[PDB]
Homo-oligomer: 277 residues x 4
């Protein structure tokens, strides 16, 4: 009813970055991923793979010590900050990162919020997902804050019940992005990308193959990596959400939508991204 | 001699569910898999992969603590109930599941039967396989109980010797499904699917590539996932058994039947399922 | 100079077994693999994959406790006898196996020889490889003993120096198979398969892609599995050696011979075996 | 400005080795890889895969004890020297190796330099990378020393700031290869391969897909393996750098350059190498 525009293929093609011959990994930046706990380990692998697939230069995974050995054989290109998400509860980060994500596979605790508060004093874009999503406010800072809730997490954040939210998704997402002064990626069919400056878009890609555990962890990583290779973080978010959906669409050409596993979205992205170049 | 009908391709096509665009993982439900022990760990990975491939929304694996790290790198989309199958011996489940499977890679012990008794107080379909199969009776409850014995396990359950069973497979399977008031999937060439209401079918798919360790663990998971995406649990069982066999048939087109590994059935299912859509 | 015949494609085609529809995993038997130590773990994975790919019904891997978790994610279809190769030093096996292999990734110790002595009291074919190969004699027993030395191991076994061996490979292999009353698979280009009854063949397949660590561990497993699905153990050995080589030849059609990894031979076998059916 | 020639396809084709039918793994030699620490484990897997893909006969990985289990499931063909890189700080090597690499995933410490000093008393080519790169001099010895710095590591080695280095890359690389009497592979677009005898080449292959963590670890392993199968170590270095780049070029034919993971370069090398045969 607000006639929110779709972020279309033309917009993706016009905004995806080049990876020029005169580049080194420093050009594409170091991301930090604060994810994975002994109790929810897989989220770190999913987000890690998403991030490294998505154009960053280096990835540091601040996961629980016992999760590290589960990532290495699948993603030997990542490096680690041992118990990083826990350590971040106690002190500001000393290292400079191009972008930070926090939350996948983390519990919904006060200590995770202390880590969030410390990460927000860095000067870079920050993504909050999953256990890092809470009812709270955000400090004025350098760099966007990007929240990636599903409708239940949106309810947790705002008190808008899911059954009311789903009637006016873009209207609520826009209202709350403005109130919180954060980007809100409100997941679902026609995911809403609402910006604090009032810009808002709908995502046209994806299908029900995505309605399964782990696909949002993969998306968080994709956003994290795209923030490292796009100069404009708005375009990084929009392109990540778009390409994530497009990977599910490629899957369903020859595979049943009931059968996708989230990690495969990362495996598909190389060929899908090429098509938009 | 009872002229039991085959569950044919036409029946599969008519009964497989859609995965609509307006869906979220909640629509497709959360399964619980109680499987894998330090001594038989692989069954949990096989059943877990089968289940997540088969249309569920979320999977919780209640496996032994030491088995968790063996699953994560292969199936990072699963989450865990640490020592769940052991914990279930002591108390009713507090969480609501769309469907439950118990037994793959579990020992044939009294404690496993205590877990079975507790799981049966939930209101959902329950599958019993492998170490959860015993000579016993079943309480009247909400939701079907689905037993998946090979002939040796059927003997354990009923006292019908294997050499007598194999002469009259459907007759015995039907008699015992009625007596126990459980679904019985009696494995073998022309697997029998006998329902407590007296309906009975034969499975027409599969071949000797399936006669190797682990393929039944994969089937248990497939049934578990299909119970989450079919409204009619009878159709979930029949389609799982059918599609499982059809994956072996696709394998033998270009691969020797001596060489299949069970996990590959899960890897094949995406393309096989698409063909029946 | 002895004009030893090649075991040709025609012989392979004529002797490979069917996997009929009326089969269960019991038909194809349970193999035991005693392999892998904390210090040489990979051999157990290589031999395990080879064996399960090669037509057995079930595989029990008696490996060191710390090696088990390294196998599971890659070969979840195997089951385990925890510290089996060590336990076998102390007592006769209580379980019946269709075939047994011992040695890959095991140290060349007296305790490994005690395990060999205990395994030889079983009534089944037994393969000795790697650390199980020693200068020794063999008891009269039911079932063939199959030794799989490379030339250096042959020297260890017999005192024939490698430089003399390599001049008269089939003559030495035949002489020693007769003296020991064991099958000897003497590895190398034109691997020699010498039988204690004086039959002897050369293998015509393979290439230098096989001249890299691990390819013999894969072969041991292939022999183990083929012993489970062939009625004639002589044919199992000959076909395993043949098909192993044929997998390397398929690799070199589109890949450099310098670049093969042994586990890939197992991955290739499904398609190669189909061609000989 | 020095008109440094490219090491071209013609030069690669003319210098790559055969793998003849009359070969055994001994012909192709045993490499030692001293890499991977609890804090940087992935480098050992990347370099290990690179090395085993690159024509060696055997690989021993002297990595930290806790890293071993992370390598095995992916590279079961490798064997181990438990805590080898640490042990090498204390004593000369007792075993003979065809080639040695040290440094990927190792900290920049004095103990790593003690290991380097001990490895240099062996008579074989030695590669120093990553944490093994330091400001130092090198003893006259049998066998080349090959340093593989990125520009920041070159600065660490020489005191030439990166912004000055990048203006005159070949001039600085040549000057320092001569001064140190080491081979210097100075990474970047148009990687420089400078020899202590004053020969110098530019690498013409590669693209920005390589500007991501781990691709240099993969290169170190590729050089290590190629040193084992080339008689001329100069040609081994040049061909490794060339083929490494060529793998990235093959990737970008159908995949976005933003999306490559380093381990995939190893997976691509089999087909790329075949093309140059
Ligand atoms: N029907 C559908 N059509 C298009 N996209 C759909 C979808 N269902 C879910 N998603 C998409 O799947 C992801 C779930 O993240 P989540 O965080 O809820 O999942 P987890 O990883 O389990 O956390 C989102 O990107 C969502 O838009
Ligand atoms: N010859 C054959 N034709 C068609 N299907 C065959 C078969 N042999 C076994 N199965 C099929 O393989 C699975 C074994 O489960 P299992 O529980 O005995 O195997 P495990 O996983 O080892 O337990 C069943 O689905 C069975 O019908
Ligand atoms: N040039 C060649 N042509 C054909 N086959 C060749 C070969 N080189 C080695 N093999 C073949 O590779 C395996 C090595 O086992 P191995 O036990 O020496 O290897 P490991 O697994 O390292 O023990 C044997 O089958 C041998 O015939
Ligand atoms: N733009 C580019 N064009 C061609 N090659 C490029 C490149 N960027 C990096 N590399 C190539 O990537 C590797 C990085 O090793 P590194 O040691 O800096 O990377 P790490 O493994 O992270 O250590 C080198 O081979 C370099 O030439
Ligand atoms: Mg989520
Ligand atoms: Mg079973
Ligand atoms: Mg051997
Ligand atoms: Mg480096």
């Amino acid at each position: 009813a607000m006639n929110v525009p779709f972020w279309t293929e033309e917009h993706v093609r016009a905004t995806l970055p080049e990876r020029d011959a005169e580049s080194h990994k420093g050009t594409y930046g170091t991301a930090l991923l604060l994810a994975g706990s002994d109790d929810m380990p897989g989220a770190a692998l999913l987000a890690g793979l998403g991030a490294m697939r998505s154009g960053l230069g280096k990835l540091v995974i601040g996961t629980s010590e016992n999760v590290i050995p589960l990532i290495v054989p699948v993603l030997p290109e990542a490096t680690y900050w041992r118990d990083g998400w826990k350590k971040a509860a106690d002190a500001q980060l000393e290292e400079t990162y191009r972008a930070i994500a926090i939350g996948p596979g983390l519990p919904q605790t006060e200590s995770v919020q202390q880590a969030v508060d410390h990460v927000l004093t860095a000067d870079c874009p920050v993504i909050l997902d999953a256990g890092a999503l809470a009812k709270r406010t955000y400090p004025k800072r350098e760099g966007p804050v990007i929240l990636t809730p599903h409708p239940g997490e949106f309810f947790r954040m705002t008190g808008v019940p899911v059954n009311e939210l789903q009637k006016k998704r873009a209207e609520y997402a826009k209202e709350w992005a403005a109130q919180l002064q954060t980007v809100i990626v409100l997941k679902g069919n026609q995911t809403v990308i609402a910006f604090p400056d009032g810009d808002c878009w709908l995502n046209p890609t994806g299908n029900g193959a995505l309605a399964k555990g782990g696909t949002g962890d993969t998306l968080t990583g994709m956003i994290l990596g795209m923030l490292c290779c796009h100069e404009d973080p708005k375009h990084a978010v929009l392109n990540a959400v778009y390409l994530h959906g497009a990977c599910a669409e490629l899957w369903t050409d020859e595979h049943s939508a009931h059968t996708l596993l989230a990690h495969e979205l990362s495996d598909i992205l190389p060929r899908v991204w090429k098509r938009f170049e």
